[PDB]
Design a binder for these strands. Sequence first.
DNA 1: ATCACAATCCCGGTGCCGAGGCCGCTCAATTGGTCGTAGACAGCTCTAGCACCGCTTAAACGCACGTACGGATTCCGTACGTGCGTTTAAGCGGTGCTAGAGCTGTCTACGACCAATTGAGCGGCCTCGGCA
DNA 2: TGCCGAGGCCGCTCAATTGGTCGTAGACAGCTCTAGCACCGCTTAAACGCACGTACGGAATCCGTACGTGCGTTTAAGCGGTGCTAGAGCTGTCTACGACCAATTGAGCGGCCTCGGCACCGGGATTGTGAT
Lengths: 78, 78, 96, 91, 102, 96, 91, 90
Amino acid sequence: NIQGITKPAIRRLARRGGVKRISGLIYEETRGVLKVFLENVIRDAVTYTEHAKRKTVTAMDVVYALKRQGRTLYGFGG
Amino acid sequence: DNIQGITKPAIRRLARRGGVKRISGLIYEETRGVLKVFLENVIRDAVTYTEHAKRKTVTAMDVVYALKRQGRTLYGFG
Amino acid sequence: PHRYRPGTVALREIRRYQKSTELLIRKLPFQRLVREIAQDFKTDLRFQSSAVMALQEASEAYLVGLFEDTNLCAIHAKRVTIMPKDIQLARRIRGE
Amino acid sequence: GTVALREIRRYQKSTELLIRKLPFQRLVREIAQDFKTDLRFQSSAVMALQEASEAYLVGLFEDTNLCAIHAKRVTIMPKDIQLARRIRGER
Amino acid sequence: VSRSQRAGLQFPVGRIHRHLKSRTTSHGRVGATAAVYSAAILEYLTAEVLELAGNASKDLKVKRITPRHLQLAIRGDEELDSLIKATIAGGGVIPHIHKSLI
Amino acid sequence: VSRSQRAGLQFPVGRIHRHLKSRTTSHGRVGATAAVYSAAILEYLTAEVLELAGNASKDLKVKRITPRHLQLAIRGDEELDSLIKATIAGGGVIPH
Amino acid sequence: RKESYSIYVYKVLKQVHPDTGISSKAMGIMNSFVNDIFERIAGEASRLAHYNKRSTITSREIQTAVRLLLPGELAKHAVSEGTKAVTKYTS
Amino acid sequence: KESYSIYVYKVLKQVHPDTGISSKAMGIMNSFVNDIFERIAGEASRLAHYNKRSTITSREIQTAVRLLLPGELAKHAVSEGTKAVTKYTS
DNA sequence: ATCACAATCCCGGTGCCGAGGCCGCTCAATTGGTCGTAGACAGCTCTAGCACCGCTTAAACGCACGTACGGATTCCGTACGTGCGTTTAAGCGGTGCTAGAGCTGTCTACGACCAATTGAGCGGCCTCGGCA
DNA sequence: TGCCGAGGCCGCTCAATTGGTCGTAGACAGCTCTAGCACCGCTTAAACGCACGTACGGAATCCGTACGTGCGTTTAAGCGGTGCTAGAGCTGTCTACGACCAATTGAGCGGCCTCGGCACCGGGATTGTGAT
């Protein structure tokens, strides 16, 4: 499912970063990077959700986890 | 002109402890500017802390609080 | 037959995707990935659509900034091609 | 390049300060003069400022050496300091 | 007769006071002038960011401020860039291609 | 019977309760077992750090802990390095 | 009920831009910005009250907090606006 | 002035019975303990704020520890806190 | 320097969904006394910060000398980019079902406060073993 | 080889423990209506595999310079003393304004409605690309 983040998607994310030539080994490394980031944020989101005794994850859990990690996000209620 | 009081051998020592093996002669001016900027920020915050307490002597507490504001937490004086 | 010399379409894509504001990862694959990742921490979870949207936006911003730092690292080595070692250097200097 | 390595080992071995106390104290007082006229400093404040400054500069030099190694060089240059301080966001 | 009107502001002094008393520590109080100062600060900061975003929107010949214009305004000023370090949702990035790439 | 003995700890439950009450819940109240849990966490972390520092000191063949040993212990563990990121006055640097 | 900062942000916008509008997404962004900056200022004020062993938050503490967070050329103007508001309110 | 010197010394002599500590290391330990306590208190108060609660309990401290400490440290800290609370209630 | 061409900007139309304004109600901002308690203010003091001077000497500085290293040049093969044909899996609209988040009412476990007692931390003095 | 510091005995003093009171925070049960999840059919678009070819990374070579090392002279840092005085810290007074409370009324939060500004399509105008 992490393979579902396709090569053209990483190419587009690189184009938005101004990258003109992309090595053929970039994509696996970027997949690892994204997996680590998501694992770090989702863990705190689920921690908040479990503390609230809820079975659902809300946008505010994600926003609080991101603010905790140092990646404050604007436009989702926090 | 006391910024020149940070002598070149002292900058060499700081670079040696950091693992730098060979140093360009243009490094010293860059290091002096970097140190001046850092010192300016920390001292500004410390002086603000001193002023809010209506005093004329800068304690170690003011320096520690100013450093903590910048995310440069320092143990041993707090 | 018309062929553009390798390097022109890359710049055209750079301009196009730096002009837009949309998301660049497909929605359904990212939702599937998020659900599978969260499957480890908890069983039988539920995700508000806004939770997945916030996660996707945070991930996209993080990856874009990381790629910009990587491009700086690559240009530093007198290159034009970004490489895994430049990603690693960008991540290490950042502290991550 | 032998004495450089010996000094590298010796300086990572020890724990003392590397900037002389009086020049740094004069620098600190001159910097603080522009913020509030007629300020005084405890010895603890100046010592803490020196400790923080030395740690900061050593870490920055580590990052700069990494940038230099990246470009297949061994001599650090101002460009490496600038890249290190731009990636961190210190600029 | 409202406290903000006596202070000549738009942001509410009273509601800001109520939110301030709910942030203090035990046996803590909040002066009535702290709300005045905080309301003035918030009004000034919002005015600055909104004026910059309005200029950015006027450049693109539009009548509505979007996340894109907020990102353009914030990332185009050094003070607001340093102070605001958040991920504006749907704001994209500022276009810039390095010279050595062309 | 002090609450520490009831909890079987070494840190002061009463003083930690007072300190938690000072920061409070923004004019609220603090539960009974909050102090016990906080004291337990503080004791565990201090025990871990001091054990590592004592091992470092014994490896250096000395009978007293110094800030150098504290930094040697902290930087020698991944998780203690992640949790603690402060500058320790008088500790030097890890050889590399 | 869920209170929000939409009214005052719209009032400020129509004060400084009597022809431009704002979006729902921009409204949410401004809500988040105001909430975050207010939280930062309030936290700094609380810490400042604790440091001097006080218990009353005062406009002196808010001024010092604004001086601590906001970068230069913003601290000056923000402090000017706050002082003007305080002086008018006392009048 | 209040300090954690005696409790830190007791913990030290519990771990290493034949090791002493210098004054500077005591200062380092005092600052470290104060910093960790400040972090835990702030996280717990914020957690009370988010869920519209007014009382800090064992659950808030447990979630704060789970959020702040990394990996195995969180697991063992949670275990020790649970043991202490179960002993206290008994 | 010239010129055909894929590609992008500009202008015009449309019709669709979101902003902006208006109503009603309700929750909280505002007012007036009471009271007390947290802080501004005046003194005292004795701590510690600062301004001199001598002097010892270890650190810094100026100069010479040689070689290790960074930068320009050249060359070449392979990894990338570009475009085309096929396909395959996302996106949209509709349908249905059900877990579960959210509000409300009771009440019962729990924590704050005060008066008394006492016991565990904090500072003082000292010294003999760890350390530079 | 001592000297310079940490571990221990001792002085009280402030806060931690008991216990009863009393209000209230939240645990729990119950119901409601939202919203998350699952399935299905089309259908246009994006992804994937492939062929071909130019640009680019990386290596090898050469050379000039710039950086490290050593030596001798100079200097100013650090130690060690000395008087001296602001001012940080503590005590005590008295008081100025913020919290609690009761009553009340207006500003803002949901809900709704409407039109106009932004989004997509389509056709000319332009503008770098790339062979000539």
